[PDB]
Symmetry: D2
Subunit: 75 residues, 4 copies
């Protein structure tokens, strides 16, 4: 679960479901500029060119981030 979306109501970064994270990450690795996914009766588009998620039912925009692991890894 490496992708996150920001919830401005709670003021915290939130995780995607395992399947939505996998849909987003597969599109990210394939070079697509955007990806759609469904969660709890809403369709969303993650726009990779702006790092913003758009709720396609309401139009609400929430920022997204990709977590990055340290290189090299610590012992």
């Amino acid at each position: 679960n490496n992708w996150r979306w920001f919830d401005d109501r709670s003021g915290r970064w939130c995780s995607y479901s395992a399947s939505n994270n996998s849909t987003i990450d597969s599109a990210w690795k394939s070079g697509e500029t955007s990806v759609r996914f469904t969660a709890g009766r809403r369709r969303y588009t993650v726009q990779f060119t702006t790092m913003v998620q758009v709720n396609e039912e309401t139009g609400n925009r929430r920022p997204v981030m990709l977590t990055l692991l340290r290189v090299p890894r610590l012992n």
Copy 2:
């Protein structure tokens, strides 16, 4: 201009001023867990452990992001 903060009023990622971007990036590269800066006579702290900017007067939290350069570089 590698650091950005999300403005939920405009629905867009926003750039820091050149000096605030430099202040934030120098603290990021030094391994600090947070950094202080001011903009428009207001004080903020960027918390690197949560990737959020905190308005010190209101407590309002806005997300932040670091732009990343491709490795390897494209020709």
Copy 3:
């Protein structure tokens, strides 16, 4: 796909097979410090703390790298 090992004979970075790349990347995302994989019966270990692949039949150490895609993505 995203992991590469350096071939000193040819002087080039080389891709892994889709299956070996998936094995390495799953272990990378799970926080493991190392991962074993095979190319047929030939055994290898990728040591994430040193970013080196050890050929477990010859003992030869080849460096490894993880490709990093640009954030945000270009249009």
Copy 4:
């Protein structure tokens, strides 16, 4: 500091001198596709499009890497 070159005699990644690391990192941040630097009587070019250091006299190719900081930062 943050750039490293692979020493296949010892089988390990090695650091650049502080000045060579600064020269490489300044060219990296400026969008250049390559950078030249010296170490005593040795002359090198780091090719960012292939992540390889080339000895200008002999053509010997040593792979390079850029260390990456975790995002978000750990406490």
